[PDB]
């Protein structure tokens, strides 16, 4: 009966009904996921066997049975939708995940809607409601002639917002009441469905609301061993301005900090400041010692820090961290101690004679200070963490020049002419520690001379 034009809302509703009926569940699934987040949030390791194991652990009879009910709702909904999610959903899903139906023996991770692993399924299902509801809401909006339908987020989600209908209880009586019949003398009875009125009643009853989103993030903390300072640096730079250390200030700190301990102490104060600034921020021109002493109240543990940082300001903080870290390692190298114990030996490959001559030539005609600082920051952030092992886009076989240029670009740092032109491509990422060591030895020789 030309419904897509004449009755688009009813058309789309009838198409998606099979799945739209499942929209009523997702407030419950959202509550479940909210409590799961609350329980596991700020946790990093998950040693749970499966959903059956998890339930047995939280075997408090009331809580066990409520969890079981919610989990069963989730599993039913997932089992139905999974074959649609494999094609639709806007969230990609390995075929194995959607392939088979799930049961209590299924891995527990399936219920935590992490943005990776089996939790994508919990995310996908939550997303696939949101499309369906939204899409039919769009259908209604396009015919409401209004542009202010109030939105809502996945936290406030309640049964009042979702499109909750029961086919037999709600819909079938509607159809049967709209289904009308006609007769004429000598002619058979024929139906004539009041399609417009079906649409209007469905709209009046079920259709309103809008959800948005909510969930955790896997990287909960990347603490000391794998700490991702790069994220902190980028957050700060977004929040406030940053600047490099003037060579004067560099030389002053170098003269003051003639001991690894003092370096470490200053650096610990810098790390605290970095965390705070990344969260809060501050005036880039504020002197760092005034900041630590007045605001953070970092007294009682600041003896020579205050004299070294007497000139430095918050904008220098990142550059100061980098200087301190490299100076810290440089001191170790001066004493022949290994500064890169946290680095994989694979990244500590040697430099062949040809590549040694090439590197020596580049370094003689290079900005040795900036080169040393940048290569050190690259090694320490990228090549240090086991976490950066599991993301192996920094393979020893990758070239060093392109890697370092990529890094510098990601932080929108200024490119030195030597980086593209003079830097030899023949040097890979495995010699990076030999490269830094050679550069620091040449610097140390230049300084002793």
């Amino acid at each position: 009966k030309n419904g897509k034009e004449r009755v688009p809302i009813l058309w789309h509703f009838l198409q998606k009904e099979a799945e739209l009926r499942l929209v009523k569940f997702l407030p419950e699934i959202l509550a479940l996921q909210r409590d799961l987040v609350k329980q596991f949030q700020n946790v990093q390791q998950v040693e749970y066997s499966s959903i059956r194991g998890f339930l047995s652990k939280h075997s408090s009879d009331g809580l066990r049975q409520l969890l079981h009910n919610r989990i069963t709702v989730f599993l039913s909904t997932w089992n139905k939708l999974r074959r649609s999610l494999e094609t639709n959903g806007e969230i990609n899903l390995p075929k194995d995940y959607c392939s088979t139906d799930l049961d209590l023996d299924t891995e527990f991770e399936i219920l935590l809607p992490r943005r990776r692993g089996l939790g994508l399924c919990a995310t996908a299902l939550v997303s696939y409601l949101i499309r369906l509801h939204n899409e039919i809401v769009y259908a209604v909006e396009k015919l409401s002639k209004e542009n202010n339908s109030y939105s809502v987020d996945a936290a406030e989600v309640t049964e009042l917002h979702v499109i909750s209908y029961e086919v037999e209880r709600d819909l079938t009586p509607l159809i049967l009441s709209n289904c009308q019949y006609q007769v004429e003398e000598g002619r058979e009875t024929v139906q004539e469905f009041d399609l417009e009125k079906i649409q209007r009643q469905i709209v009046s009853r079920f259709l309103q609301g809008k959800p948005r989103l909510s969930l955790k993030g896997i990287p909960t903390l990347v603490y000391r061993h794998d700490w991702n300072y790069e994220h902190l640096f980028m957050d700060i730079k977004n929040k406030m301005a940053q600047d490099s250390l003037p060579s004067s200030v560099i030389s002053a700190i170098s003269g003051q900090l003639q001991s690894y301990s003092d370096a470490c102490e200053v650096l610990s104060v810098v790390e605290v400041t970095l965390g705070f600034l990344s969260t809060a921020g501050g005036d880039p021109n504020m002197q760092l010692n005034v900041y630590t002493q007045d605001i953070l109240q970092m007294g009682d543990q600041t003896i020579h820090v205050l004299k070294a940082l007497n000139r430095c300001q918050l904008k220098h903080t990142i550059a100061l961290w980098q200087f301190l870290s490299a100076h810290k390692s440089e001191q170790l190298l001066r004493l022949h101690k290994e500064p890169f114990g946290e680095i994989s030996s694979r990244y500590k490959a040697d430099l062949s004679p040809e590549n040694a001559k090439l590197l020596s030539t580049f370094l003689n005609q290079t900005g040795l200070d900036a080169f040393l600082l940048e290569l050190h920051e690259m090694i320490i952030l990228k090549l240090k963490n086991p976490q950066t092992q599991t993301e192996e886009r920094f393979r020893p076989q990758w070239s060093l020049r392109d890697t370092l240029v990529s890094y510098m670009q990601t932080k929108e740092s200024e490119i030195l002419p030597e980086m593209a032109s003079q830097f030899p491509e023949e040097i890979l990422l495995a010699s990076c520690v030999s490269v830094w060591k050679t550069a620091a030895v040449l610097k140390w020789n230049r300084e002793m001379r």
Binding site: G62, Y223, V272, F276, T279
Partner: protein, 246 residues
């Protein structure tokens, strides 16, 4: 005593807070946390003394739980003496040990701060207009280890449940934990008991709990005020409200 744990906590307050990230992106939070904890970590008033004591006790609990996973936890000094890296970072052995203890305590202190100061909690301890019953309930909850269960942890996210404005806090301490507790008790009573008799069984179970007996100590207007405050926090926890009239 052997060690000035008050000073160690005060030294670790900044490092711990630096571990804390908020969902609502309340930039002005960590600074106020630092001010509040440095003010509270004292023995000036009985409330500060109790807060400090409970902090130490819970730190002891966390550290003992961790120690139950480690070999020869008495040998920690020796292990530090074997960490040339920590030695040379610190210079003096005494500072090495101090740093060791600070590193052990900072994660746990950050965790505890995340639990206690979730929405705006700590404003209640320091704000002078906070009634006595509010501080007493704050410390009662904080002292309890089975009601305010704080699991270990091995970017810490402070799960702010309300959309509260900064400079404002939950009108009832740990309103979120109390709500969770009463909901667990509702579930237990509901499944144990029929739909009729569930109210009485739920009220009785609560009254038999530590918090029920505590609030039973509160009589008269304080309890009425507590109930009003809890209603308000209950609403904020259940329904998102964009206005104060609503």
């Amino acid at each position: 005593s052997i060690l000035d744990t008050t000073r160690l906590l005060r030294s670790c307050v900044q490092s711990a807070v630096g571990m804390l990230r908020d969902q609502n992106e309340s930039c002005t939070r960590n600074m106020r946390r630092v001010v509040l904890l440095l003010g509270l970590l004292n023995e000036d008033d009985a409330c500060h003394a109790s807060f400090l004591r409970v902090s130490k006790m819970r730190l002891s609990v966390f550290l003992k739980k961790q120690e139950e996973s480690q070999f020869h936890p008495l040998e920690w000094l020796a292990r530090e003496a074997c960490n040339q890296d920590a030695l040379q970072e610190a210079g003096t052995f005494r500072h090495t040990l101090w740093k060791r203890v600070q590193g052990a305590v900072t994660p746990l202190l950050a965790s505890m701060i995340s639990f206690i100061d979730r929405d705006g909690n700590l404003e209640l301890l320091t704000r002078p207009d906070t009634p006595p019953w509010a501080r007493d309930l704050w410390m009662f909850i904080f002292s309890d280890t089975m009601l305010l269960n704080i699991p270990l942890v091995m970017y810490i996210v402070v799960q702010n449940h309300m959309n509260l404005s900064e400079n404002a806090s939950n009108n009832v301490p740990f309103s979120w934990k109390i709500k969770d507790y009463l909901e667990e008790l509702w579930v237990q009573a509901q499944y144990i008991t029929d739909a009729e008799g569930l109210p009485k069984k739920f009220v009785d179970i609560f009254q038999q709990t530590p918090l029920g007996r505590f609030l039973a100590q509160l009589h008269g207007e304080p309890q009425q005020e507590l109930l009003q405050c809890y209603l308000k926090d209950f609403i904020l926890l259940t329904m998102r409200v964009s206005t104060e009239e609503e």
